[model samples]
Target: HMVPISFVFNRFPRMVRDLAKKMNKEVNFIMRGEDTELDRTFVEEIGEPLLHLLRNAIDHGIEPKEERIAKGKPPIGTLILSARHEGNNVVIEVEDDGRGIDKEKIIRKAIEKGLIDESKAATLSDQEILNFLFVPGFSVGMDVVKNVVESLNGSISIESEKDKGTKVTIRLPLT
Candidate 1:
């Protein structure tokens, strides 16, 4: 008894939008490739983790309306939720046009949290700094997401640029 992934995600937009309103921000939740399907069990497992990411993107990623206007960007932020079939896997992406993850900030947080030393932080690439998000006691819920994805034979990647945006991609085996 498998359900379409879209069926599972149909109510997310409304939920996110309400949250955005409370945060004094406007967001456009755009979903693509809605017909893409997944194992019902996998869908259930991914739901909470995915929702956490979406909430993080809205709460921490998107800036306030005044901030967006100050940056010469549209006041209404954009969140793109997309899915597609890629070979034997399903690729899902949650992207936002908002204040991106700050690599330097993350490095500093890592050092403060004793996850890394200052000397090591300087040599780490942007990707490496972002990888710290998956470290326990770092970003909330990220470690759990990583664990869930990996347990399902999936992979997750993050990309971001300051003042640009951030994109999180997760790929899971179809089976």
Candidate 2:
């Protein structure tokens, strides 16, 4: 049976918000499309992975207040969680206004870890480079989230700009 996802979804941000405060990071947690409904099972399956992503946002995505201010960005960072219906799928996104990913750094790490050859990395697009994060031990626990989403007939994609921000979108079949 379908359930209002908001019932379970709303609490996570509050939890993360508190943790962020404790860590001395000022963050604005925003949510949209909370009323969007989903299978109760789907809601349950998403919580932990979603928490990991939010934690990553606070731990790695958003820079410290001083760093953000120095970069000319607001001292308070923004974290957006949105969910919407797209055809037969539910699309959820977690976005943060913070220090965006450094493609070169990731590439270097990938090379050093033997995940990809240096020559191949030079020709890879940003999206392709970002895909490497899903490799085991490459990212901050994204592999587990990717596996869970894939197992449920879903897909995840990442978009990021250096010094701008990052957005991770997940799409799951409505069924």
Candidate 3:
């Protein structure tokens, strides 16, 4: 009851293309590990979560052309979708060469959303502030991913550096 990873990754290249075209941003979409296998029913259950990550990568992960140029970065942004196996888990990553999440703005957004009180914003640890990004209504783009990953007892993590890029990784059990 397994399926080729392509069944899910196949949709992303085109998705980034159309979305990039619409935003008038030039993006190079790359895919890796298409040969990896995923649980069949998990494949069906996983598509939307991956879609959410892809959408965020294209929208917030990749910077606009002007922003890229101004920052002395390549005018054409890059987004990578990869899948691979590591021990007892399947790992997938959505990576983009674009501006990373601004911790300051993240805190600001949380405050603006009333998710975090302004008085306590200064008291939040970096890890705690970073976590505000996935709060259901904090960002609809990340909502389904968190919901699905937790539902399946998987792990989701974000790695980022300001002005560098963001990498969203998801690991699901091989079983």
lDDT of 3 by residue, 1-175 (tens): 7788999888878888998888777899999999999787777778888887777777877888888999999899988989999999899998888888788998888888988788999999777777776688677467667878878778888887877888989998888
RMSD of 3: 1.6
What TM-score do all the candidates reach, one by one?
0.95, 0.94, 0.91
Task: Using TM-score, give the best candidate's number.
Answer: 1
Q: Model 1 over residues 1-175: C-alpha lDDT tens digits? A: 4557897578789889898988887899998988998877797788887898899889988899999999999989999999989999889999999999988888999999998898988999899999998886686378888888897889999999998889999998887
Evaluated against the true structure, the overall lDDT of model 3 is 0.84
Mind sharing the TM-score for model 1?
0.95
Per-residue lDDT of model 2, residues 23-118, tens digit only:
788899998999887777887788887888888888888998999989999889999888988989889999998788888998998999998898
Among these predictions, the greatest lDDT belongs to 1
Sort order, TM-score high to low: 1, 2, 3
Which of 2 and 3 is the better model by TM-score?
2
Error of 2 at 22 (Å): 2.7
Clashing residue pairs in candidate 1 are none
Compared with the true structure, all predictions reach lDDT values of 0.87, 0.86, 0.84
